[PDB]
Amino acid sequence: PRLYFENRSKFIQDQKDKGINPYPHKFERTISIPEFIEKYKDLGNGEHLEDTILNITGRIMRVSQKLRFFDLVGDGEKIQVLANYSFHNHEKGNFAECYDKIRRGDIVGIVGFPGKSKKGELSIFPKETILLSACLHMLPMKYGLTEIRYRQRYLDLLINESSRHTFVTRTKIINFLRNFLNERGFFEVETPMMNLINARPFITHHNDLDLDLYLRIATELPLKMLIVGGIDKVYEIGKVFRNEGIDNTHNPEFTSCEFYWAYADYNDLIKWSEDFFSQLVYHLFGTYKISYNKDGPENQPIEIDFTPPYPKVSIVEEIEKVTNTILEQPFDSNETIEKMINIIKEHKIELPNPPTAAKLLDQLASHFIENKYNDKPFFIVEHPQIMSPLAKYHRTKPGLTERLEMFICGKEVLNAYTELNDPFKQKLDSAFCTSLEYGLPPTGGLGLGIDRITMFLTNKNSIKDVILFPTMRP
Amino acid sequence: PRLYFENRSKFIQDQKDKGINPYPHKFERTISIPEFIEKYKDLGNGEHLEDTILNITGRIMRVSKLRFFDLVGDGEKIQVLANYSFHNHEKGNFAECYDKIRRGDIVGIVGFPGKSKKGELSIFPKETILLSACLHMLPMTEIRYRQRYLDLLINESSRHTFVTRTKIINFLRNFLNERGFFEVETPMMNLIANARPFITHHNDLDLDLYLRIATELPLKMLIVGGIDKVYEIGKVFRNEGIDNTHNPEFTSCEFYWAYADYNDLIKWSEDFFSQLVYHLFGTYKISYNKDGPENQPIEIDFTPPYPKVSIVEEIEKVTNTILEQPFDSNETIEKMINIIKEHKIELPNPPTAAKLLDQLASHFIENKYNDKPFFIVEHPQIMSPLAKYHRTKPGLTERLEMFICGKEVLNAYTELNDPFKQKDSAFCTSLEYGLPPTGGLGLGIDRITMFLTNKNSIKDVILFPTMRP
Ligand SMILES: C[C@@H]1CCC[C@H](C[C@@H]2Cc3cc(O)cc(O)c3C(=O)O2)O1
Ligand SMILES: C[C@@H]1CCC[C@H](C[C@@H]2Cc3cc(O)cc(O)c3C(=O)O2)O1
Ligand SMILES: N[C@@H](CCCC[NH3+])C(=O)O
Ligand SMILES: N[C@@H](CCCC[NH3+])C(=O)O
């Protein structure tokens, strides 16, 4: 009843006073729990491997006359502990005084032999049990977990069995991406997180240079510079910081991977995306199809099919076609801008302030196009050069660029394009523009939204679920 | 100077004006330069394979009826041997084409593989487009760190450096993963080691956040969560001084090993460093120019085991003094401060017991060896707030630090888990939920790279080091 702590703290101090160390230095375990289940799951009911002493450790998660049961968890797997007065080595002390000290949450060292119960329960049978690290608080009951999960993540990880899955998956995702690129000749680099130079940035102050720096909003410019350097296939997975608002799909600090492929272009990157996504999902599910609760764990889930190829939708054409309106170039012209503001009002969507063309197009696309498909990922392609300042101009469609955005359930996870490489047509940094002048070969570059990808492949509604310690208000 | 540019700027506008695109969208290459060298290195001199048309790209880096070039791709050079005989004059005039190709230019080449009468491996072109023009004059200081891209292009070893750095990180990742470890990302910004933080403001939360100075606290929490083998390779931000061995943002790996201890973490370190060095050289011994490429190199030997030198014992034994505990007593502080003046070393201000032990160690132990890496073990508790108390030696902790050529590259120890002896609120609370016996270790990736690439300065091992404008 929440005063357990003071009790437990006193007991610890009492243990110290009686000369016993309750936080011992090293216990030499000879096997882990996942191994123990792997090694011993094929013993027959009631069988004991009486002549196999093992040193094993875990965390007690249920303390169940002269006999005691326990639940021992470790690396996310449990076995049972069957301590028996008959089997206890009495030289180490009074059996019932030894086990009456063990609480739920306690971390223990067990010297015993591997066996099974009459029921066929795989267990370990100890001669000796030592307390290695005690749990002083009252641990939440199995399925007793809100907003405790995000602050006290360790508690989430210990009680809620799927929580470990989420984060194991997350790493399998990154491990994949790393290999997928490395196999394809790519070369992982580190670029600076702090700099002198579209999103509002985080600002911080360097002391020994007495200068205000800006935490990076992407990894684009330094990466492109390395292509100039002759590192033809280059990539970086890392944190990036944007100072905008927070929601279920947005978090101020988030993981992103960008790569730059020299001599490639739009079409190569479309192939890349399709190849990567389909394979990744298959690597994790043995199928290109997954279930996904778009509306929540209470509502019916939808099915997403990752079988390539995926649908391509052109940004301009589609909006025209959905509204029966035609949008004359330049898109920033007074006739065309005023036309869009009419469409935003005529369909009653929230209007962006300030109303600049590219910002009006994004909101239009956002409402009309971005919910075209939920059952498969799809691309929105060939964005106008006004939305796409660093992208190469479309080689046949004037005004547009060779740009792609991939969408899963209406949210953006990928963004790539052919890199504008002619320094003249680049109408940002002095160093960057200087690099262009030294010759950037035809390049195609892409970026992934790791956390959003992780959300979809772990069936989560909130980005906070797939980040270990999300940035939260106190 | 500037004129070279102005001319090339115009040569572009002229080519654009003339109906030719000097920056085309795509070129369909079928082989890379390293691949070209692999498949065709065994050709006999002067022998051609005129019936194998290949598409190749690269950068022109030397310009010699016949026109010679050097084409570089991914860190290797091959010769372009342009011959009036093979030139497809339907595309353009042989001379009117190759006259406009300057040094630095990136070009697409359609030709065939073969060697010159000399036996030199070349590429024999029919057509040669301009893929991306180089406007500035390439050099034949402070340019290296500012414009790394030039450095990677001209200096052949600059690439070997950064390739080695990536090989080093990859090695580490596999080493840990192979051993059951689990890579994570703990948050880059926090609400709260001993070092000055970077501070920044989040607008929409209206809250001021500190950039992480270490990964120690949130990793240790995950061990509480049951992730018994957890790690992170990532940047850490310390708002400190800058020099050959310090850079406000650097790359660290911290890993946390539940059920291990001080003794295991030595074996781990000895194992890892030896194995890494053998991976990159095929020998446990390397050469390192401590004083510079002009002065004689010393030899660094990575054969296990390495020496363990006890920090208190060693200072004591070296100065003929004893330092009575507590080290923070008026008695012992004065005895320390006196040794600092008596051997004309810089006194740290504030002179706290913890910092005076540091400088004393810094001068009197930290250059004990240079021909082998060595550990400094058993630091006092007043130096080691997160380190578990030594199990036989009162006042000491179960800590280790490993040094190569006077510089610290590894800091590790048995973790303190008795939340009582821990004299962040989130972090403190977790220890109350039970942190098992754990070992835990940190590496300086940027320094380790300096030593394994023979480099005097941390800047040489960072692609775009943070400079003054
Ligand atoms: C670098 C990647 C490229 C693919 C799409 C994503 C788009 C969003 C933008 C974004 C902005 C933001 O302020 C916070 C975010 O988590 C995210 C996010 O989840 O990724 O960005
Ligand atoms: C956290 C890691 C553990 C291993 C040793 C290094 C210690 C030094 C400290 C340090 C501080 C600093 O402000 C900048 C640095 O590059 C370095 C560095 O290279 O490593 O730190
Ligand atoms: N920097 C882009 C991703 C890569 C686009 C291609 N250079 C973004 O964050 O949207
Ligand atoms: N956080 C330590 C490295 C880990 C030492 C063992 N917990 C440091 O900043 O150097």
PDB file of N, CA and C in Angstrom, chain A residues 16 21 23 25-26 59 133 136-137 164 167 170-171 188 190-191 193-194 202-207 215 228-230 232 243 253 255 263 392-393 395 402 422 437-440, chain B residues 21 23-25 57 59 74 106 132 135-136 153 159 165-166 182-183 185 188-189 199-200 202-203 224 226 235 237 239 248-249 251 264 388-389 398 418 432-435:
ATOM      1  N   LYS A  16      22.349  -5.140   5.903  1.00  0.00           N
ATOM      2  CA  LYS A  16      23.674  -4.541   6.067  1.00  0.00           C
ATOM      3  C   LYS A  16      24.149  -4.600   7.517  1.00  0.00           C
ATOM      4  N   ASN A  21      25.479  -8.513   2.648  1.00  0.00           N
ATOM      5  CA  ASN A  21      25.448  -7.549   1.549  1.00  0.00           C
ATOM      6  C   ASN A  21      24.289  -7.864   0.611  1.00  0.00           C
ATOM      7  N   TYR A  23      23.517  -6.077  -2.106  1.00  0.00           N
ATOM      8  CA  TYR A  23      23.876  -5.697  -3.472  1.00  0.00           C
ATOM      9  C   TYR A  23      25.288  -6.228  -3.733  1.00  0.00           C
ATOM     10  N   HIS A  25      28.687  -7.941  -5.550  1.00  0.00           N
ATOM     11  CA  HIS A  25      29.463  -7.384  -6.658  1.00  0.00           C
ATOM     12  C   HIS A  25      29.291  -8.146  -7.973  1.00  0.00           C
ATOM     13  N   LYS A  26      29.542  -9.447  -7.935  1.00  0.00           N
ATOM     14  CA  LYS A  26      29.455 -10.274  -9.134  1.00  0.00           C
ATOM     15  C   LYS A  26      28.916 -11.643  -8.784  1.00  0.00           C
ATOM     16  N   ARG A  59      14.593 -12.034 -12.768  1.00  0.00           N
ATOM     17  CA  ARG A  59      13.802 -11.172 -11.912  1.00  0.00           C
ATOM     18  C   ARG A  59      12.529 -11.873 -11.498  1.00  0.00           C
ATOM     19  N   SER A 133      19.964  -7.844  -6.355  1.00  0.00           N
ATOM     20  CA  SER A 133      19.468  -6.485  -6.468  1.00  0.00           C
ATOM     21  C   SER A 133      17.974  -6.469  -6.133  1.00  0.00           C
ATOM     22  N   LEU A 136      12.545  -2.094  -4.467  1.00  0.00           N
ATOM     23  CA  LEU A 136      12.013  -1.457  -3.264  1.00  0.00           C
ATOM     24  C   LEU A 136      10.566  -1.007  -3.441  1.00  0.00           C
ATOM     25  N   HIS A 137      10.187  -0.634  -4.659  1.00  0.00           N
ATOM     26  CA  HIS A 137       8.800  -0.236  -4.902  1.00  0.00           C
ATOM     27  C   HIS A 137       7.837  -1.387  -5.174  1.00  0.00           C
ATOM     28  N   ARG A 164       8.406  -4.811 -25.391  1.00  0.00           N
ATOM     29  CA  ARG A 164       9.749  -5.242 -25.779  1.00  0.00           C
ATOM     30  C   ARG A 164       9.795  -5.532 -27.277  1.00  0.00           C
ATOM     31  N   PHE A 167      10.298  -2.503 -29.581  1.00  0.00           N
ATOM     32  CA  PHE A 167      11.612  -1.909 -29.673  1.00  0.00           C
ATOM     33  C   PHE A 167      12.656  -2.830 -30.242  1.00  0.00           C
ATOM     34  N   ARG A 170      12.044  -2.370 -33.851  1.00  0.00           N
ATOM     35  CA  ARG A 170      12.609  -1.081 -34.236  1.00  0.00           C
ATOM     36  C   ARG A 170      14.056  -1.222 -34.626  1.00  0.00           C
ATOM     37  N   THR A 171      14.796  -2.013 -33.859  1.00  0.00           N
ATOM     38  CA  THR A 171      16.217  -2.191 -34.122  1.00  0.00           C
ATOM     39  C   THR A 171      16.446  -3.103 -35.331  1.00  0.00           C
ATOM     40  N   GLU A 188      28.585   4.445 -44.858  1.00  0.00           N
ATOM     41  CA  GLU A 188      28.021   5.218 -43.721  1.00  0.00           C
ATOM     42  C   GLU A 188      28.948   6.268 -43.098  1.00  0.00           C
ATOM     43  N   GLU A 190      29.390  10.126 -40.665  1.00  0.00           N
ATOM     44  CA  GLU A 190      28.843  11.066 -39.677  1.00  0.00           C
ATOM     45  C   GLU A 190      29.052  12.479 -40.130  1.00  0.00           C
ATOM     46  N   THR A 191      27.980  13.275 -40.088  1.00  0.00           N
ATOM     47  CA  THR A 191      28.041  14.718 -40.364  1.00  0.00           C
ATOM     48  C   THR A 191      27.604  15.513 -39.117  1.00  0.00           C
ATOM     49  N   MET A 193      25.950  17.655 -36.237  1.00  0.00           N
ATOM     50  CA  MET A 193      24.581  17.958 -35.806  1.00  0.00           C
ATOM     51  C   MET A 193      24.345  19.438 -35.543  1.00  0.00           C
ATOM     52  N   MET A 194      25.426  20.203 -35.376  1.00  0.00           N
ATOM     53  CA  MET A 194      25.365  21.646 -35.126  1.00  0.00           C
ATOM     54  C   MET A 194      26.039  22.416 -36.243  1.00  0.00           C
ATOM     55  N   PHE A 202      16.112  24.454 -33.937  1.00  0.00           N
ATOM     56  CA  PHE A 202      16.535  24.611 -32.542  1.00  0.00           C
ATOM     57  C   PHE A 202      17.827  25.424 -32.489  1.00  0.00           C
ATOM     58  N   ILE A 203      17.872  26.444 -31.630  1.00  0.00           N
ATOM     59  CA  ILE A 203      19.089  27.266 -31.493  1.00  0.00           C
ATOM     60  C   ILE A 203      19.756  27.099 -30.131  1.00  0.00           C
ATOM     61  N   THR A 204      21.075  26.923 -30.164  1.00  0.00           N
ATOM     62  CA  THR A 204      21.897  26.695 -28.977  1.00  0.00           C
ATOM     63  C   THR A 204      23.234  27.457 -29.102  1.00  0.00           C
ATOM     64  N   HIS A 205      23.927  27.647 -27.979  1.00  0.00           N
ATOM     65  CA  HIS A 205      25.085  28.531 -27.920  1.00  0.00           C
ATOM     66  C   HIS A 205      26.384  27.795 -27.626  1.00  0.00           C
ATOM     67  N   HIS A 206      27.353  27.891 -28.530  1.00  0.00           N
ATOM     68  CA  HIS A 206      28.679  27.352 -28.230  1.00  0.00           C
ATOM     69  C   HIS A 206      29.496  28.355 -27.411  1.00  0.00           C
ATOM     70  N   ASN A 207      29.987  27.918 -26.253  1.00  0.00           N
ATOM     71  CA  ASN A 207      30.764  28.792 -25.378  1.00  0.00           C
ATOM     72  C   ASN A 207      32.128  29.172 -25.940  1.00  0.00           C
ATOM     73  N   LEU A 215      20.976  23.485 -34.592  1.00  0.00           N
ATOM     74  CA  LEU A 215      20.879  22.039 -34.715  1.00  0.00           C
ATOM     75  C   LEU A 215      20.187  21.678 -36.028  1.00  0.00           C
ATOM     76  N   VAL A 228      30.317  15.343 -54.051  1.00  0.00           N
ATOM     77  CA  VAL A 228      31.330  16.219 -54.651  1.00  0.00           C
ATOM     78  C   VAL A 228      32.743  15.714 -54.345  1.00  0.00           C
ATOM     79  N   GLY A 229      32.912  15.106 -53.173  1.00  0.00           N
ATOM     80  CA  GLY A 229      34.218  14.612 -52.746  1.00  0.00           C
ATOM     81  C   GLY A 229      34.626  13.304 -53.386  1.00  0.00           C
ATOM     82  N   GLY A 230      33.672  12.648 -54.053  1.00  0.00           N
ATOM     83  CA  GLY A 230      33.912  11.363 -54.713  1.00  0.00           C
ATOM     84  C   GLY A 230      33.470  10.139 -53.926  1.00  0.00           C
ATOM     85  N   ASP A 232      30.745   8.312 -53.810  1.00  0.00           N
ATOM     86  CA  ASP A 232      29.624   8.231 -54.757  1.00  0.00           C
ATOM     87  C   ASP A 232      28.339   7.657 -54.193  1.00  0.00           C
ATOM     88  N   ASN A 243      11.860  22.353 -34.666  1.00  0.00           N
ATOM     89  CA  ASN A 243      11.249  23.067 -33.552  1.00  0.00           C
ATOM     90  C   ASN A 243       9.767  23.328 -33.643  1.00  0.00           C
ATOM     91  N   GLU A 253      12.536  15.813 -31.859  1.00  0.00           N
ATOM     92  CA  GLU A 253      13.703  15.018 -32.274  1.00  0.00           C
ATOM     93  C   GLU A 253      13.320  13.603 -32.784  1.00  0.00           C
ATOM     94  N   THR A 255      14.417  10.108 -35.791  1.00  0.00           N
ATOM     95  CA  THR A 255      15.462   9.428 -36.563  1.00  0.00           C
ATOM     96  C   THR A 255      15.198   9.496 -38.056  1.00  0.00           C
ATOM     97  N   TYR A 263      25.011   9.172 -59.952  1.00  0.00           N
ATOM     98  CA  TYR A 263      24.663   8.634 -61.277  1.00  0.00           C
ATOM     99  C   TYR A 263      23.257   8.020 -61.375  1.00  0.00           C
ATOM    100  N   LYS A 392      16.176  18.696 -59.010  1.00  0.00           N
ATOM    101  CA  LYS A 392      16.328  18.910 -60.458  1.00  0.00           C
ATOM    102  C   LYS A 392      14.978  19.080 -61.143  1.00  0.00           C
ATOM    103  N   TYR A 393      14.922  19.990 -62.115  1.00  0.00           N
ATOM    104  CA  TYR A 393      13.712  20.226 -62.912  1.00  0.00           C
ATOM    105  C   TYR A 393      13.340  18.961 -63.703  1.00  0.00           C
ATOM    106  N   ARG A 395      12.703  16.654 -66.597  1.00  0.00           N
ATOM    107  CA  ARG A 395      13.361  16.709 -67.919  1.00  0.00           C
ATOM    108  C   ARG A 395      12.402  16.872 -69.114  1.00  0.00           C
ATOM    109  N   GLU A 402      11.700  16.192 -60.657  1.00  0.00           N
ATOM    110  CA  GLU A 402      11.695  14.735 -60.582  1.00  0.00           C
ATOM    111  C   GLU A 402      11.671  14.265 -59.122  1.00  0.00           C
ATOM    112  N   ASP A 422      23.436  21.691 -61.189  1.00  0.00           N
ATOM    113  CA  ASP A 422      23.947  22.818 -61.973  1.00  0.00           C
ATOM    114  C   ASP A 422      23.858  24.091 -61.131  1.00  0.00           C
ATOM    115  N   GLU A 437      29.951  24.232 -57.333  1.00  0.00           N
ATOM    116  CA  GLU A 437      30.783  24.850 -58.354  1.00  0.00           C
ATOM    117  C   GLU A 437      31.983  23.964 -58.693  1.00  0.00           C
ATOM    118  N   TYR A 438      32.263  22.997 -57.825  1.00  0.00           N
ATOM    119  CA  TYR A 438      33.346  22.058 -58.073  1.00  0.00           C
ATOM    120  C   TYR A 438      32.860  20.802 -58.817  1.00  0.00           C
ATOM    121  N   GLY A 439      31.553  20.754 -59.088  1.00  0.00           N
ATOM    122  CA  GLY A 439      30.961  19.695 -59.893  1.00  0.00           C
ATOM    123  C   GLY A 439      30.312  18.576 -59.107  1.00  0.00           C
ATOM    124  N   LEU A 440      28.983  18.626 -59.029  1.00  0.00           N
ATOM    125  CA  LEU A 440      28.182  17.552 -58.453  1.00  0.00           C
ATOM    126  C   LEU A 440      27.638  16.691 -59.599  1.00  0.00           C
TER     127      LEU A 440
ATOM    128  N   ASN B  21      23.202  20.401 -73.382  1.00  0.00           N
ATOM    129  CA  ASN B  21      23.036  20.403 -71.923  1.00  0.00           C
ATOM    130  C   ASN B  21      24.300  19.916 -71.194  1.00  0.00           C
ATOM    131  N   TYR B  23      24.850  19.803 -68.008  1.00  0.00           N
ATOM    132  CA  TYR B  23      24.444  19.046 -66.837  1.00  0.00           C
ATOM    133  C   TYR B  23      23.214  18.191 -67.197  1.00  0.00           C
ATOM    134  N   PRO B  24      23.441  17.041 -67.876  1.00  0.00           N
ATOM    135  CA  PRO B  24      22.322  16.178 -68.293  1.00  0.00           C
ATOM    136  C   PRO B  24      21.734  15.409 -67.116  1.00  0.00           C
ATOM    137  N   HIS B  25      20.491  14.955 -67.259  1.00  0.00           N
ATOM    138  CA  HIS B  25      19.783  14.275 -66.178  1.00  0.00           C
ATOM    139  C   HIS B  25      20.370  12.919 -65.802  1.00  0.00           C
ATOM    140  N   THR B  57      31.799   6.287 -65.976  1.00  0.00           N
ATOM    141  CA  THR B  57      31.820   7.667 -65.472  1.00  0.00           C
ATOM    142  C   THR B  57      33.013   7.845 -64.535  1.00  0.00           C
ATOM    143  N   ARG B  59      35.938  11.173 -62.681  1.00  0.00           N
ATOM    144  CA  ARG B  59      36.399  12.551 -62.670  1.00  0.00           C
ATOM    145  C   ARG B  59      37.751  12.659 -63.344  1.00  0.00           C
ATOM    146  N   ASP B  74      35.717   6.402 -57.094  1.00  0.00           N
ATOM    147  CA  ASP B  74      35.719   5.726 -55.789  1.00  0.00           C
ATOM    148  C   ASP B  74      37.107   5.439 -55.228  1.00  0.00           C
ATOM    149  N   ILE B 106      33.700  16.061 -64.425  1.00  0.00           N
ATOM    150  CA  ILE B 106      33.071  14.733 -64.358  1.00  0.00           C
ATOM    151  C   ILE B 106      32.434  14.423 -65.711  1.00  0.00           C
ATOM    152  N   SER B 132      29.279  16.626 -65.406  1.00  0.00           N
ATOM    153  CA  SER B 132      29.248  17.774 -64.510  1.00  0.00           C
ATOM    154  C   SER B 132      30.579  18.514 -64.525  1.00  0.00           C
ATOM    155  N   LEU B 135      34.067  24.119 -62.166  1.00  0.00           N
ATOM    156  CA  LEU B 135      34.337  25.528 -62.490  1.00  0.00           C
ATOM    157  C   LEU B 135      35.629  26.076 -61.881  1.00  0.00           C
ATOM    158  N   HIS B 136      35.975  25.633 -60.677  1.00  0.00           N
ATOM    159  CA  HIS B 136      37.176  26.144 -60.016  1.00  0.00           C
ATOM    160  C   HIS B 136      38.430  25.385 -60.401  1.00  0.00           C
ATOM    161  N   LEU B 153      39.577  14.424 -52.556  1.00  0.00           N
ATOM    162  CA  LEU B 153      39.907  14.314 -53.981  1.00  0.00           C
ATOM    163  C   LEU B 153      41.407  14.309 -54.288  1.00  0.00           C
ATOM    164  N   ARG B 159      40.943   9.799 -47.767  1.00  0.00           N
ATOM    165  CA  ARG B 159      39.927   8.740 -47.905  1.00  0.00           C
ATOM    166  C   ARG B 159      40.224   7.512 -47.013  1.00  0.00           C
ATOM    167  N   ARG B 165      37.755   4.943 -40.304  1.00  0.00           N
ATOM    168  CA  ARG B 165      36.795   5.324 -39.263  1.00  0.00           C
ATOM    169  C   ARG B 165      35.478   4.533 -39.391  1.00  0.00           C
ATOM    170  N   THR B 166      34.944   4.404 -40.601  1.00  0.00           N
ATOM    171  CA  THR B 166      33.713   3.612 -40.798  1.00  0.00           C
ATOM    172  C   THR B 166      33.888   2.100 -40.584  1.00  0.00           C
ATOM    173  N   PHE B 182      22.218  -5.195 -27.827  1.00  0.00           N
ATOM    174  CA  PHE B 182      21.024  -4.596 -28.397  1.00  0.00           C
ATOM    175  C   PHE B 182      21.178  -3.077 -28.569  1.00  0.00           C
ATOM    176  N   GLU B 183      21.310  -2.606 -29.807  1.00  0.00           N
ATOM    177  CA  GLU B 183      21.511  -1.185 -30.088  1.00  0.00           C
ATOM    178  C   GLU B 183      20.226  -0.371 -30.006  1.00  0.00           C
ATOM    179  N   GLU B 185      18.407   3.931 -29.230  1.00  0.00           N
ATOM    180  CA  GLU B 185      18.620   5.374 -29.195  1.00  0.00           C
ATOM    181  C   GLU B 185      17.851   5.954 -28.028  1.00  0.00           C
ATOM    182  N   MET B 188      18.250  12.719 -27.358  1.00  0.00           N
ATOM    183  CA  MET B 188      19.363  13.656 -27.540  1.00  0.00           C
ATOM    184  C   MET B 188      19.236  14.900 -26.661  1.00  0.00           C
ATOM    185  N   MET B 189      18.002  15.182 -26.246  1.00  0.00           N
ATOM    186  CA  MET B 189      17.680  16.304 -25.376  1.00  0.00           C
ATOM    187  C   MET B 189      17.100  15.824 -24.068  1.00  0.00           C
ATOM    188  N   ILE B 199      22.757  24.229 -24.040  1.00  0.00           N
ATOM    189  CA  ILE B 199      21.374  24.490 -23.690  1.00  0.00           C
ATOM    190  C   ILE B 199      20.630  25.098 -24.881  1.00  0.00           C
ATOM    191  N   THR B 200      19.401  24.636 -25.090  1.00  0.00           N
ATOM    192  CA  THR B 200      18.547  25.140 -26.155  1.00  0.00           C
ATOM    193  C   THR B 200      17.114  25.205 -25.665  1.00  0.00           C
ATOM    194  N   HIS B 202      12.971  24.704 -26.486  1.00  0.00           N
ATOM    195  CA  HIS B 202      11.905  24.245 -27.347  1.00  0.00           C
ATOM    196  C   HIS B 202      10.752  25.213 -27.303  1.00  0.00           C
ATOM    197  N   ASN B 203      10.434  25.767 -28.467  1.00  0.00           N
ATOM    198  CA  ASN B 203       9.340  26.724 -28.631  1.00  0.00           C
ATOM    199  C   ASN B 203       7.971  26.283 -28.118  1.00  0.00           C
ATOM    200  N   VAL B 224      17.428  -1.904 -16.152  1.00  0.00           N
ATOM    201  CA  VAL B 224      16.345  -2.072 -15.154  1.00  0.00           C
ATOM    202  C   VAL B 224      15.136  -2.660 -15.876  1.00  0.00           C
ATOM    203  N   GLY B 226      15.136  -4.686 -18.282  1.00  0.00           N
ATOM    204  CA  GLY B 226      15.351  -6.070 -18.607  1.00  0.00           C
ATOM    205  C   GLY B 226      16.134  -6.262 -19.877  1.00  0.00           C
ATOM    206  N   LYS B 235      26.332  10.701 -30.982  1.00  0.00           N
ATOM    207  CA  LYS B 235      27.092  11.899 -30.627  1.00  0.00           C
ATOM    208  C   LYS B 235      26.748  12.308 -29.202  1.00  0.00           C
ATOM    209  N   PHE B 237      27.312  15.866 -26.513  1.00  0.00           N
ATOM    210  CA  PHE B 237      27.616  17.294 -26.592  1.00  0.00           C
ATOM    211  C   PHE B 237      28.142  17.888 -25.280  1.00  0.00           C
ATOM    212  N   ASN B 239      29.988  21.316 -23.768  1.00  0.00           N
ATOM    213  CA  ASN B 239      30.297  22.703 -24.097  1.00  0.00           C
ATOM    214  C   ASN B 239      31.596  23.106 -23.486  1.00  0.00           C
ATOM    215  N   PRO B 248      33.736  19.890 -29.117  1.00  0.00           N
ATOM    216  CA  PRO B 248      32.467  20.004 -28.407  1.00  0.00           C
ATOM    217  C   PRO B 248      31.449  18.904 -28.723  1.00  0.00           C
ATOM    218  N   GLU B 249      31.374  18.450 -29.980  1.00  0.00           N
ATOM    219  CA  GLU B 249      30.526  17.289 -30.335  1.00  0.00           C
ATOM    220  C   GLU B 249      31.351  16.104 -30.838  1.00  0.00           C
ATOM    221  N   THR B 251      31.885  11.444 -30.859  1.00  0.00           N
ATOM    222  CA  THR B 251      31.130  10.222 -31.061  1.00  0.00           C
ATOM    223  C   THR B 251      31.550   9.234 -30.016  1.00  0.00           C
ATOM    224  N   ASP B 264      35.374  -8.353 -15.938  1.00  0.00           N
ATOM    225  CA  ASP B 264      34.936  -8.767 -17.271  1.00  0.00           C
ATOM    226  C   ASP B 264      35.260  -7.673 -18.286  1.00  0.00           C
ATOM    227  N   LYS B 388      30.524   1.678  -8.628  1.00  0.00           N
ATOM    228  CA  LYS B 388      30.360   0.872  -7.406  1.00  0.00           C
ATOM    229  C   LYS B 388      31.641   0.826  -6.572  1.00  0.00           C
ATOM    230  N   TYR B 389      31.483   0.844  -5.255  1.00  0.00           N
ATOM    231  CA  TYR B 389      32.627   0.809  -4.339  1.00  0.00           C
ATOM    232  C   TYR B 389      33.476  -0.459  -4.498  1.00  0.00           C
ATOM    233  N   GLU B 398      35.410   0.304  -8.395  1.00  0.00           N
ATOM    234  CA  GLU B 398      35.838  -0.741  -9.352  1.00  0.00           C
ATOM    235  C   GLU B 398      35.878  -0.214 -10.792  1.00  0.00           C
ATOM    236  N   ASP B 418      23.167   0.287  -5.420  1.00  0.00           N
ATOM    237  CA  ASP B 418      22.478   0.458  -4.162  1.00  0.00           C
ATOM    238  C   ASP B 418      22.008   1.875  -4.135  1.00  0.00           C
ATOM    239  N   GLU B 432      15.723   2.257  -7.554  1.00  0.00           N
ATOM    240  CA  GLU B 432      14.818   1.738  -6.543  1.00  0.00           C
ATOM    241  C   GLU B 432      14.001   0.525  -7.023  1.00  0.00           C
ATOM    242  N   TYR B 433      13.850   0.410  -8.336  1.00  0.00           N
ATOM    243  CA  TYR B 433      13.128  -0.709  -8.929  1.00  0.00           C
ATOM    244  C   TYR B 433      14.057  -1.913  -9.191  1.00  0.00           C
ATOM    245  N   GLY B 434      15.357  -1.703  -9.037  1.00  0.00           N
ATOM    246  CA  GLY B 434      16.266  -2.818  -8.974  1.00  0.00           C
ATOM    247  C   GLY B 434      17.149  -2.905 -10.174  1.00  0.00           C
ATOM    248  N   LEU B 435      18.383  -2.442 -10.037  1.00  0.00           N
ATOM    249  CA  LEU B 435      19.356  -2.549 -11.100  1.00  0.00           C
ATOM    250  C   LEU B 435      20.310  -3.675 -10.766  1.00  0.00           C
TER     251      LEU B 435
END
